[PDB]
Enzyme design. Structure first.
Site, mmCIF file in Angstrom:
data_model
loop_
_atom_site.group_PDB
_atom_site.id
_atom_site.type_symbol
_atom_site.label_atom_id
_atom_site.label_comp_id
_atom_site.label_asym_id
_atom_site.label_seq_id
_atom_site.Cartn_x
_atom_site.Cartn_y
_atom_site.Cartn_z
ATOM 1 C CE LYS A 156 2.010 -3.422 -1.191
ATOM 2 N NZ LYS A 156 1.495 -3.341 -2.623
ATOM 3 C CB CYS B 91 -8.810 -1.433 1.199
ATOM 4 S SG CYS B 91 -9.847 -0.112 1.836
HETATM 5 C C1 LIG Z 1 3.842 -2.800 -8.184
HETATM 6 C C2 LIG Z 1 2.862 -1.788 -7.713
HETATM 7 C C3 LIG Z 1 2.383 -1.866 -6.393
HETATM 8 C C4 LIG Z 1 1.450 -0.955 -5.921
HETATM 9 N N1 LIG Z 1 0.982 -1.035 -4.615
HETATM 10 C C5 LIG Z 1 0.261 -0.021 -4.131
HETATM 11 C C6 LIG Z 1 -0.172 -0.066 -2.749
HETATM 12 O O1 LIG Z 1 0.321 -0.992 -2.042
HETATM 13 N N2 LIG Z 1 -0.891 0.970 -2.294
HETATM 14 C C7 LIG Z 1 -1.298 1.983 -3.124
HETATM 15 O O2 LIG Z 1 -1.984 2.916 -2.653
HETATM 16 N N3 LIG Z 1 -1.023 2.010 -4.462
HETATM 17 C C8 LIG Z 1 -0.189 1.092 -4.981
HETATM 18 N N4 LIG Z 1 0.146 1.101 -6.310
HETATM 19 C C9 LIG Z 1 -0.297 2.213 -7.132
HETATM 20 C C10 LIG Z 1 0.771 3.258 -7.213
HETATM 21 O O3 LIG Z 1 0.905 3.797 -5.906
HETATM 22 C C11 LIG Z 1 0.286 4.337 -8.177
HETATM 23 O O4 LIG Z 1 -0.912 4.884 -7.613
HETATM 24 C C12 LIG Z 1 -0.051 3.821 -9.581
HETATM 25 O O5 LIG Z 1 0.991 2.905 -9.961
HETATM 26 C C13 LIG Z 1 -0.088 4.980 -10.616
HETATM 27 O O6 LIG Z 1 1.124 5.745 -10.662
HETATM 28 P P1 LIG Z 1 2.260 5.608 -11.834
HETATM 29 O O7 LIG Z 1 1.557 5.848 -13.111
HETATM 30 O O8 LIG Z 1 3.436 6.454 -11.430
HETATM 31 O O9 LIG Z 1 2.568 4.118 -11.799
HETATM 32 C C14 LIG Z 1 1.065 0.154 -6.819
HETATM 33 C C15 LIG Z 1 1.556 0.223 -8.108
HETATM 34 C C16 LIG Z 1 2.493 -0.679 -8.567
HETATM 35 C C17 LIG Z 1 2.963 -0.586 -9.976
HETATM 36 C C1 LIG Z 2 -7.054 -6.703 -6.445
HETATM 37 C C2 LIG Z 2 -6.426 -5.785 -5.477
HETATM 38 C C3 LIG Z 2 -5.726 -6.154 -4.269
HETATM 39 C C4 LIG Z 2 -5.113 -5.223 -3.355
HETATM 40 C C5 LIG Z 2 -5.165 -3.856 -3.694
HETATM 41 C C6 LIG Z 2 -4.599 -2.780 -2.931
HETATM 42 C C7 LIG Z 2 -3.064 -2.675 -3.135
HETATM 43 C C8 LIG Z 2 -2.735 -2.205 -4.415
HETATM 44 C C9 LIG Z 2 -2.080 -3.022 -5.329
HETATM 45 C C10 LIG Z 2 -1.730 -4.406 -5.054
HETATM 46 O O1 LIG Z 2 -1.085 -4.756 -4.068
HETATM 47 O O2 LIG Z 2 -2.125 -5.226 -5.865
HETATM 48 N N1 LIG Z 2 -1.730 -2.601 -6.614
HETATM 49 C C11 LIG Z 2 -2.094 -1.264 -7.021
HETATM 50 O O3 LIG Z 2 -1.836 -0.873 -8.157
HETATM 51 N N2 LIG Z 2 -2.774 -0.436 -6.101
HETATM 52 C C12 LIG Z 2 -3.118 -0.879 -4.801
HETATM 53 O O4 LIG Z 2 -3.726 -0.088 -4.031
HETATM 54 C C13 LIG Z 2 -5.815 -3.526 -4.918
HETATM 55 C C14 LIG Z 2 -6.447 -4.436 -5.824
#
Ligand SMILES: Cc1cc2nc3c(=O)[nH]c(=O)nc-3n(C[C@H](O)[C@H](O)[C@H](O)COP(=O)(O)O)c2cc1C
Ligand SMILES: Cc1ccc(CCc2c(C(=O)O)[nH]c(=O)[nH]c2=O)cc1
Ligand SMILES: Cc1cc2nc3c(=O)[nH]c(=O)nc-3n(C[C@H](O)[C@H](O)[C@H](O)COP(=O)(O)O)c2cc1C
Ligand SMILES: Cc1ccc(CCc2c(C(=O)O)[nH]c(=O)[nH]c2=O)cc1
Lengths: 313, 313
Positions: free
Chosen positions: B44, B131
């Site tokens: 994460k 970010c």
């Molecule tokens: C619950 C949740 C949390 C996420 N947190 C992150 C994050 O912490 N860092 C990040 O780079 N992307 C994060 N993402 C984005 C996923 O890594 C991914 O890029 C995005 O969900 C698209 O892929 P998918 O269509 O397989 O969901 C998050 C997505 C979900 C659904």
């Molecule tokens: C409003 C906001 C806060 C924090 C982030 C970065 C973490 C992140 C999150 C998240 O922790 O909300 N969700 C995603 O789908 N992609 C992400 O990269 C992205 C958007």
């Protein structure tokens, strides 16, 4: 219960219309959209001169939506203007004419000519801020200074209420910036959210190939892929532009989808991909479905719920 | 027939891994991903200090995908660094550590500390360029000068090969510009396309309400909604960054979706929403489905088709 409404000094039998570019390019198309149950219609975005557009295949549809890189094929402004001026039957429903010049000057030249027809006949302008790629600069609505220029120049040249067709935004800062620009122009009375989600890529697994020919298969996405994007943009602009109307476009296949657009803030609801796929009969189904959801909920008017999406806490 | 890859001086049994933020927040999560048949895992996205994230509900899933505004909840850097340096079993598979500091200075502080562990244990950095930066400005990767700053400073402070997690773009001008920025940084060895499609809005028709609490319901979209957008970005970057690897992320539910990503140019393939929904079992299914497609087409390795999407004429 009827879904009749009034805006921009026009009366509409219901909030539905085609999305620009779908079933609106030829005289035949416009007559068909006129004979439909839609509440209004919009012409294909036009340039001063006719365009063939891009090589085929340039549109393809799938269960979840569509991709297109048509290339603004159109019969040219003289044709749409003559349609507006001489052929359209305004007793059937209102007409919107969409303009998409390749420069500010071309837009100014079209709108000067449109103005007296808008005065005389009541045709309404939708100015399309999306255009073919020019290497080295973004689409106009993604360049806020260029957008402010276009709108200043069109406003001076046109001098009457008009609307703008916006691509989707994906960043809250962008929403704030874009809405601030649009709010500088009191003649901008409606905002249409959204145009296709730009430069997607559909790939066929069996053939290992992209499915449209232009731009190495890259094109704008419509349909079910884009509904939550469209709703966000409708609502973002509805919130930020309280003195303007918002027209929703994107992902409408059902009266339920239309309902969500209106909850989000939509006055009119445009139909693109689903119209291209199902044909103009879709408008009776969408009306029936929307009235059915209303009846089940006890809503008698669209005004009762437009913009009323609930937030949590 | 095999799914093996060697890259970044590491060996991977197959190209599948979780997407950052899914099934990777806690030691329990990371041990689960390690025990799964994935070829790798990413932790994460972390900040220097632990974060509770936003109020719930903050993630919701539906037939066509997911929306989230989690607010970067995480156990803090020290925890993910300890997992990398002391707890992860690297004989099982490789580890990526994702970081997402709230300012450039916070990223620099984290990477300075990660560096000796990267060198000694072979943990790989994924810097999240979604970010948020200054509120009221766009996310970092949508602000190219901020992106350049972040990459200069992290490059200097880390001094080792790393990768970046990119949001989707929608305009060819942005593909051009973003890839040119990345190509300034020879230590950026991989580019992960894409993060969520930003600031969508899901509305529940029955309750007339948004479905997540933060941001008045606006959040990032994942899943089936975003596959063509993801494929476009993988291919755009694959074509523009010939000396970098591209990792695909977005809309992978099946071996076929993975196959498309790989035809687009993906090396590793991440899985977010579908993994959140189906659990880690999905990895055996995806492996099986992809090997079945390969066998039908006579492909014995990934290299035989990676990046070989065909265009029309
Ligand atoms: C619950 C949740 C949390 C996420 N947190 C992150 C994050 O912490 N860092 C990040 O780079 N992307 C994060 N993402 C984005 C996923 O890594 C991914 O890029 C995005 O969900 C698209 O892929 P998918 O269509 O397989 O969901 C998050 C997505 C979900 C659904
Ligand atoms: C409003 C906001 C806060 C924090 C982030 C970065 C973490 C992140 C999150 C998240 O922790 O909300 N969700 C995603 O789908 N992609 C992400 O990269 C992205 C958007
Ligand atoms: C074949 C095709 C042609 C289009 N041409 C135009 C156009 O000329 N002007 C315009 O503003 N939008 C045009 N669009 C965009 C649509 O008006 C609409 O914004 C988009 O398709 C999203 O709506 P949908 O989800 O209902 O398809 C076109 C869409 C399609 C599919
Ligand atoms: C690459 C490109 C060409 C032309 C336009 C403007 C016309 C238009 C088109 C089109 O004619 O290709 N398709 C859309 O989905 N929306 C539009 O606004 C937009 C983008």
């Amino acid at each position: 219960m009827c879904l009749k409404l009034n805006l921009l000094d026009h009366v509409f039998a219901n909030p539905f219309m085609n999305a620009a570019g779908v079933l609106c390019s030829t005289e035949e198309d416009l007559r068909c959209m006129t004979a439909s149950s839609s509440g209004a219609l919009v012409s294909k975005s036009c340039t001063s001169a006719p365009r063939d557009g891009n090589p085929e295949p340039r549109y393809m549809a799938f269960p979840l939506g569509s991709i297109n890189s048509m290339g603004l094929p159109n019969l040219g402004f003289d044709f749409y203007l003559k349609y507006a001026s001489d052929l359209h039957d305004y007793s059937k429903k209102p007409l919107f004419l969409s303009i998409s010049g390749l420069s500010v000057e071309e837009n100014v030249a079209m709108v000067r000519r449109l103005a007296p027809v808008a005065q005389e006949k009541g045709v309404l302008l939708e100015l399309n801020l999306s255009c073919p790629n020019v290497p080295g600069k973004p689409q106009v609505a993604y360049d806020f200074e260029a957008m402010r220029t276009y709108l200043q120049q069109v406003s001076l040249a046109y001098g009457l209420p008009f609307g703008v067709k916006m691509p989707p935004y994906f960043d809250i800062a962008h929403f704030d910036t874009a809405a601030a620009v649009l709010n500088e122009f009191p003649l901008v009375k409606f905002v249409t959210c959204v145009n296709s989600v730009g430069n997607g890529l559909v790939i066929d697994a069996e053939s290992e190939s992209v499915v449209i020919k232009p731009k190495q298969g890259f094109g704008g996405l419509g349909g079910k892929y884009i509904l939550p994007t469209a709703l966000a943009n409708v609502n973002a602009f509805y919130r930020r532009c309280p003195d303007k109307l918002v027209f929703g476009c994107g992902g409408v296949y059902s009266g339920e989808d239309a309902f969500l657009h209106i909850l989000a803030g939509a006055s009119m609801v445009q139909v693109g991909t689903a119209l291209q796929e199902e044909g103009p009969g879709i408008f009776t189904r969408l009306e029936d479905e929307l009235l059915e959801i209303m009846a089940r909920k006890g809503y008698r008017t669209l005004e009762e719920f437009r913009g009323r999406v609930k937030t949590i806490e």
